[PDB]
Amino acid sequence: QKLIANQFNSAIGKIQDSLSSTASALGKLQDVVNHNAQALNTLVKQLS
C-alpha cells in the first residue's frame, strides 16, 4: 500500500511540472480562443 501511495503521489506531483512545460500542452484550449479572436478580427478588418 505504501508503494502504491508513493507512486500515486509521485505521479500527481509530476502533473504540474508537465503542464508547466512544452508550450503546447494546453494548445487545444488556446485554439478555440485564437480561432474566435481571428474570426472577430477578420470581421473588423473586412470593414476597411
Partner 1 sequence: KNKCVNFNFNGLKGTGVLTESNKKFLPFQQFGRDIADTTDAVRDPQTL
38 three-state secondary structure: helix
DSSP 1: -
Complex with partner 1: residue 23 or 44, whichever CB lies closer = 44
Asked if 48 is part of the footprint of partner 1 (rule: CB under 8 A), the reply reads yes
Asked if 39 is part of the footprint of partner 1 (rule: CB under 8 A), the reply reads no
Complex with partner 1: residue 19 or 40, whichever CB lies closer = 40
Rg for the chain (alpha carbons), in Å?
20
Alpha-carbon gap, residue 28 to 33, rounded angstroms = 9
Asked if 45 is part of the footprint of partner 1 (rule: CB under 8 A), the reply reads yes
Residues near partner 1 (CB under 8 A) are: 41, 44-45, 47-48
